[PDB]
Amino acid sequence: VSEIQLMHNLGKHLNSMERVEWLRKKLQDVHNFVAL
């Protein structure tokens, strides 16, 4: 529940080392602000 098509597409849904790419692209979503 809540992990709909658009929600699951957010950072392709991750776990930990994958899950960080989500937190990196989220900072780069605010302004195409490339993270690391």
Curated annotation (Swiss-Prot):
UniProt effect for mutating L27A: Strongly reduced affinity for PTH1R
Region: Important for receptor binding, residue numbers: 19-36
Domain of life of the organism encoding this protein: Eukaryota
Subcellular location: Secreted
Subunit structure: Interacts with PTH1R (via N-terminal extracellular domain).
Biological role stated in the UniProt entry: Parathyroid hormone elevates calcium level by dissolving the salts in bone and preventing their renal excretion. Acts by binding to its receptor, PTH1R, activating G protein-coupled receptor signaling. Stimulates [1-14C]-2-deoxy-D-glucose (2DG) transport and glycogen synthesis in osteoblastic cells.
UniProt record similarity statement: Belongs to the parathyroid hormone family.
Disease in which the protein is involved: Hypoparathyroidism, familial isolated, 1: A form of hypoparathyroidism, a disorder characterized by hypocalcemia and hyperphosphatemia due to a deficiency of parathyroid hormone. Clinical features include seizures, tetany and cramps. FIH1 inheritance can be autosomal dominant or recessive.
UniProt-recorded name of the protein: Parathyroid hormone
Gene behind this protein: PTH
